Design a protein around this ligand. Sequence first.
Ligand SMILES: Nc1ncnc2c1ncn2[C@@H]1O[C@H](COP(=O)(O)OP(=O)(O)OP(=O)(O)O)[C@@H](O)[C@H]1O
Ligand SMILES: Nc1ncnc2c1ncn2[C@@H]1O[C@H](COP(=O)(O)OP(=O)(O)OP(=O)(O)O)[C@@H](O)[C@H]1O
Ligand SMILES: [Cl-]
Ligand SMILES: [Cl-]
Ligand SMILES: [Cl-]
Ligand SMILES: [Cl-]
Ligand SMILES: [Mg+2]
Ligand SMILES: [Mg+2]
Lengths: 733, 733
Amino acid sequence: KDYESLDYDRCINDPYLEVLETMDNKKGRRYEAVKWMVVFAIGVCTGLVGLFVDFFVRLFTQLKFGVVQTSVEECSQKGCLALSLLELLGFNLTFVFLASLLVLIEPVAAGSGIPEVKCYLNGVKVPGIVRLRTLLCKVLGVLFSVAGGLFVEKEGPMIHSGSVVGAGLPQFFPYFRSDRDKRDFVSAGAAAGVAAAFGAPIGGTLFSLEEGSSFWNQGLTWKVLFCSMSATFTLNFFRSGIQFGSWGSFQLPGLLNFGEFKCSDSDKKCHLWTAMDLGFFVVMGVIGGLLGATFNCLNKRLAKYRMRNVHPKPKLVRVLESLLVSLVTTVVVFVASMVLGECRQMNSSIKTFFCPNDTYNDMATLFFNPQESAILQLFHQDGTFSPVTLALFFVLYFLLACWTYGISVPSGLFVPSLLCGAAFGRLVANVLKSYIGLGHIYSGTFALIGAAAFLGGVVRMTISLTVILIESTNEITYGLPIMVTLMVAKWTGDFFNKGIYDIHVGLRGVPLLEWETEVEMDKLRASDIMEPNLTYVYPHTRIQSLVSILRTTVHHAFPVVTENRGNQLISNNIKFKKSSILTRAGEQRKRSQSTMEERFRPLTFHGLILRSQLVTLLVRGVCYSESQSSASQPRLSYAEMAEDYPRYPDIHDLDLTLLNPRMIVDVTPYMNPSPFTVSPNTHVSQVFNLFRTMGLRHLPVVNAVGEIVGIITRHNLTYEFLQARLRQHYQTI
Amino acid sequence: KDYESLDYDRCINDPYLEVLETMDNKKGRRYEAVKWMVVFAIGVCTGLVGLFVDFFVRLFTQLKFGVVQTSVEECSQKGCLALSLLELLGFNLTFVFLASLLVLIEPVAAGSGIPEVKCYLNGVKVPGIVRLRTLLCKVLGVLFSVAGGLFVEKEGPMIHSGSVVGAGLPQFFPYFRSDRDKRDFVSAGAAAGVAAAFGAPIGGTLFSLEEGSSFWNQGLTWKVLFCSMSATFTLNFFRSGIQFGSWGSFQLPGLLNFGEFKCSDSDKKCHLWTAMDLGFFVVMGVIGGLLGATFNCLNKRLAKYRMRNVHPKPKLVRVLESLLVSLVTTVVVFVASMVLGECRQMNSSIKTFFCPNDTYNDMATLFFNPQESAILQLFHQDGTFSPVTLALFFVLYFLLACWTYGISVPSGLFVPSLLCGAAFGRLVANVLKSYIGLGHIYSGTFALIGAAAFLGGVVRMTISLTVILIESTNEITYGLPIMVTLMVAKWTGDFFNKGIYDIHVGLRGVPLLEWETEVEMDKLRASDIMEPNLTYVYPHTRIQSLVSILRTTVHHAFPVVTENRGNQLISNNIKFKKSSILTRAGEQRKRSQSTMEERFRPLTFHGLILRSQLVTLLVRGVCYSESQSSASQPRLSYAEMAEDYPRYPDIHDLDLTLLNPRMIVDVTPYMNPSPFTVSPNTHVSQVFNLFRTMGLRHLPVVNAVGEIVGIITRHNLTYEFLQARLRQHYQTI
Ligand SMILES: Nc1ncnc2c1ncn2[C@@H]1O[C@H](COP(=O)(O)OP(=O)(O)OP(=O)(O)O)[C@@H](O)[C@H]1O
Ligand SMILES: Nc1ncnc2c1ncn2[C@@H]1O[C@H](COP(=O)(O)OP(=O)(O)OP(=O)(O)O)[C@@H](O)[C@H]1O
Ligand SMILES: [Cl-]
Ligand SMILES: [Cl-]
Ligand SMILES: [Cl-]
Ligand SMILES: [Cl-]
Ligand SMILES: [Mg+2]
Ligand SMILES: [Mg+2]
C-alpha cells in the first residue's frame, strides 16, 4: 500500500511573510483566545459524543434484557427454555447486522480506532480516518455492536471518535487550515477521548504526548490538558444528572470507572496493600505477560488467516462472519448460564437465572450484566463467585474476545482485556486465601493487579497506561504496585511478540517511525539511507518540465536547486543564484552600513517546493513569458494558496489544454527557502531525532560545499529499511 | 556575571566510533540494566535524605516546644511571662545562627533551590549547585532554619537536594561521565525530590519534563517516573514505620500531605463541590493572583535593596540580618499568641497557651504547631478559628514570609504560600456561610482553592503545579476547580510581574531560554542574531596558533574550517579538504561499486572542536613534526579523553614550556564532524526551537555554498538580545 505523510513542518514563504507583517501582537492574542475557545468546544463535543453512546447503549441493553428475562421465567416454568434463546438470537443478530452494514459503508471504522490514531499522530494519513462519515459509522456502529453482546468495548473507539471531532471542528478562519494545527487539534481530541472514556485527563494528556513524540510544546500541552478536563467534566455533569436527580453534582466520572477502593472499617489489620504483597504482584505481572503474549499470538494468526481468506471475498462475506461470531457468542453465553452456573444463596445488579427461589446465578450475573458493571462486581465483592465459575468465565471470555477482535464491527479491546484480568486476580485471591491466611490485605487489590497485568500483557503500553490506571483507581497508594506490574508484564511479553496495536498496524504495512533507533543503526550513516537519484525543480522553470515531472513521478516534494557548473531561463537562474548567496564579508558590511555523470550532477541546494504548491500555481495563471521580466507575476496571496487546502487537485484532473507550455514560472517566492538539513556524515540517530521530533517531511542531505547530495523521507527511516541497510553494510565489510 | 552552558549535545568522533564498533547488543542491554539500577539508587537516596530532614526537624521542634511550654505555664502562673520568651529567643537565635554559618560556607545554598534547578536543567551551570558540600550545607541548613521558626519550608530545598544526589551518584563506569547523562540524571533527581516532598510522582515527572524542555525521550521519562515512585515509596515506608508501629504498611505519603477530603456522612446534600461553586472559584483565583502579584512586587523590591546594601558588606553582615529577622519573627509570634488570640472552649495537635482551663488558643495553635499540621487544621477542621484570627494570621504570615525569603538561610516558598492561601480560603468560607447559606458543599474545598490560587499567584507554575496539587489532594474530582484557578490566578498576575523563580533568576542575570519565541521575533532572521567575527581552527593547525587563540579568547568551541580561496600545513589542509568532500556522483558510484576583507574570508565549514578537547590534546603529546606524515599520532582513545571530565584544566594552569611550538596537531579525528546547522535564511523561531529542544550548544550558521557565515550560542537567543535586535530591525526600516 501507499501512504502519504502529513505536512506538519511550517513553510515560511513570501505570502506568509506578508501576513506576518500585517499581524501585530493584539491580533496574536485574539487568535490565541479563539484557539482556547476551539479547544474547549472540542472537549465539550467529545463529552457529548460519549454521552450519546453511553445513553443509548444502556437504553438498548435494558430493553433486550427485559424482553428475555420474562421470557426466561415463563419458558423455564413451562420447561421449554427455547423461546428466550430465540429472542436473544434475534436481538443479537439484528444489532450485529446493523453494526456490520455501517462498516461495509466505511471500512476504516472496523476495529479499535487506536491503531489509526497512532498513525495519524505519527503522521501517516490513513486515507479515511478524519472525515465525518467515519464518525457516523463508528459512533452508531459501536452502540449496535456492544448492545448485541459481542464481548467488545465502548471506551476503545472513543479515542478515534474524539480524534475525528478534533480534526473536524477547527475547520469552519483560515488560520486553522494547515496540518500544523490539524495535528495539534487531533492530539487534543485524542486526549479528550481518553479522558472521557476512562476519567483520567492526565492519562489522556500523556497518551497524546507520546504517539506524537515531538518537541516539548509548553502551551499545547496546557491546552490538551484543558480539553481533556472539559471532556471528562461535561460527560460527568450529564451522566450524574440523568442517572441521579441532582444536576450540579459530579458523582461519577467517565464511561469506565472502577469505584472506591476502601477496606472495611471492622478490620484494623486490613490494608490496601503491604510490602509483602509486592512479591505476589511481580508474579502476577509475569503471568499476565504470558497470557497477553498468548492472546497476541492467537489473534495475529487469526488476522493473518482473515486477510487472505475473508477480505478477498465479496461484500456478502464479512457480514456472515460477524453473524456467525454473534450466534456462537449468544449460544455459549446462554448455555454456560443455564449449565455450568452455580446457584448460590443470596439487588438490581444481581441476576437470578435458571436458579431456585432466594438464589442467584453467579455466571448469569457475570454475563448478563454490562461489562462495566461486571468489572465493579469483580473488584469490590467477595464470596459472590466460586473459583470454578471464575476459571470457566476467564477461559470463555478470553477465547471469545481473542476470536472477536478483527471482525468488521467496531470492536474495542480495553474492557475485554481489563475484565479477564479482573477474573484472574479474583481467582488468585480466592485460592490464596484458602491456601494460606492472607486476610490482612484488601482482596480487590489482587483483582486490580490482575487486570493491570493483563492490560500490560496485551496492549503493552507504558507511562500513559500507568497514569490512566492510577487516576482511574482514585488511589495514589496504587502508584507503585501498578507500575511494577506494568513494567514486568511488558518485559515478559516482549520476548515473544509486540503489542497488539503494533501487530495490527504492521499487518497493514503502515510505515511507522519507532520510538528510537538502536545503537547498531547508530553505527549507520545518513549517506547510506538517503536517495541519490533526485527529481528537482529549477527556479524559473518551464511549464513543460513541471507537467512532465508531475505526471512521471509520484513524489510530493521537489528540491529547488541550480546547476553548480532557454537563454532567458539560464540568465534568470544565474541572477537568482548570484543574488541569493550571502557571504560572511557581505553580512559584516551590511551590519556596518546599517550519461551517469550527466544524470548525477553537482546541484546547489536552494529550497524545497511541494507538489501541492506546484499544482496550485499551475491551476492559476502564474507564469510569465520569456520576453517580459520575471518581476511580473500574479503573486498569489497566502489565503489564495490556502483556499483549496483539505483536498488538493490531482495533476491528471487538470485539463492542461489552457496552459501554454514553454512559459517560465517562478517558484522562488513560494518555496520553503530554509528547511532543516543534515550533513552526509550525520549518523542515523541524529537524523531520526530530527525527523521524529521536528515532525518534518523530506529532509534533504547537503554536503560541505552546499551541493544537495540526497533526500530522505519516512520510508527511509522505517525499521525494515534500516535493518536491510545495516545487513548490507555488514556484508560490504 | 559569566555563565557556561552544558555540553549536552553528543559528540561522535573516532574514539567514540571505536567504542561503538567494540560494543554489541548484549553490552547495550547490560548498560541499560545498570542505568535502571542507578536510577533506583538515586530515588532511594533522595527518599533517605528526605527522611533525615523530616526526623530531625521534628526532633528539634518537639524539644524546643517542650522546654518553653512548661516554662510558659509556670511563668504565666507567676505572671512573669518573660523567661519563656528568653528561652524561645535563645533556641531560635542559635538555630538561625547555625543555619547562616552553613550558608556563609556555601553561598549557593541560600534560598530555595528551584531557581538553581531551573537553570541547570536549562543548561547554564551555576558554579556550585551539584557538589557534595552544597548538599551538606543545604540539608543541614534547612533543619536548623525551619526548626528555628523562620516561616520557611522543607519541601522547597528538597528539589535541589535530590538534584545534587542525581548529579553525584552516577559518577563513581566511564559510560556515565558525559553531561549528556548528567543532565538526564539531575532531571530524574529533581523528579524524585518533588515526589518525596509532595507525594506526587507524576507531578515530579511533569516538573522534570519542562524546565528541561527537550525532545520527547520515551524511555527517559519511564525512568524518571520510576525514580520518583521509588523516592516517594521509600520515604513512605520509613515514615509510616517510625511514627506508627506497622512497618510493611504505607500509611502516609511524603513530607507535605493534605489529608482526606471527604464530607460527613450525616449530610447527604453535602458535596465536595458543585457547578455553582465554579463562579466562586474564578473570583478566588483572581484575588489570589493579585495577592501573589503584591507578594512578588514587595519581594523584588526587597531583593534589589539587599543586593546593593547587604551583599557588598563584610561577612559579619548577612548573619546579623538573619538574626534580626529571627528575633522579629519570634517576638511577633509570641506577642500575637498572648494578645490577639481568642481563647475558645474545646487532642495532641491542639495547643493551649495564655488561656484558662478547658480553653485553647486558636492563634497559638496556628503558630506553635508545625506548618504541615497547621495546613491540615485549616483544611479539614471547621469552627476552630474565628475570622478575625484568620485575617490577622494571614496578614502577619504574608508580611513575614515576604520579608524572610532572600536572607542567607535555606528558605522555602511552597508551604508559606500554600499556608496563607489556606487561611484566606477558610476566611472566605466562614464569611460566605454567615452571609448566605451554602451548607450544601464541603467547607475545606474553599481552603484548598484558596491555597491553590495563592500558589498560582506566587510561583505561577502550570501543568506541573496542577498535577502536583491534584495528586496531593488524592481526589480526581478536584481536577477542574484546581486547574481553572491556576490558569486565572496566573492570567491575573501576568499583567503585573513574573513569578518568584523568574524574578530571582533574572536578578542574578542568568541567561535563560524562554519557553518559546514571540511572533515579532519570528519576523527576525538568523543572520541578524549570529556572530560574523569568528575564531576558527584549521585542521592540522600549529601549537602556537592554538595557545594564542586559547589565551586570547574565552570561547569554548571553535569551528574547524578550511580556506575556500607552512608548506606542509597547507598541503595537509588541501588534502583533507579534497578527501572530505563527497559528491553526489561519488555517492552513486560508491553504491554501484558496492584589512576587512582579509579578516572576513570565505571559510568552508568542516566541524566543531571544543576548548576542552583542545586542552586535552595540548596536555598530552598529541603532535607530529612537519617532516613526518600526519598519520603518525598518539591517537588518544575515548577513555583517555574522558579521564578528566568533571573539571578540565585551564590553559593558564599549563606550564607550556614543554610544548614545542610550530608543531602541527591534527584535530580532525577528535572534532564533531557533523553538528546541527542552520541556513542564514532560517527564522528565529526555527533556530530557537532547534537550540532549545536538541539541547545543543554553539549552533553554526552556514550559507548555501558551504561557507560558515556565523555562530550562535545561548547568549544570542536570550530575551534581551532578541528585543534589542528587533528594535534595531524596526529602526533600520
Ligand atoms: N523529490 C524526490 N526526488 C527523489 N527521490 C525522492 C524525492 N522525494 C522522495 N524521494 C525518495 O523516494 C522514496 C519514497 O518516495 P515517495 O514517493 O514515497 O515520497 P513522497 O510521497 O513524496 O513522501 P511521503 O510518503 O513521506 O509523503 C524515498 O527513498 C525518498 O527518499
Ligand atoms: N568560536 C566562536 N567564534 C566567534 N564568536 C563566538 C564563538 N563562540 C561563541 N561566539 C559568540 O560569542 C558570544 C558569546 O561568547 P561566549 O564567550 O559567551 O561563548 P562560550 O563561552 O563558548 O559559550 P557558552 O556561554 O554558551 O558556554 C556570542 O555572541 C556567541 O555567538
Ligand atoms: Cl475500550
Ligand atoms: Cl482498544
Ligand atoms: Cl517548600
Ligand atoms: Cl520554593
Ligand atoms: Mg506517497
Ligand atoms: Mg562562557
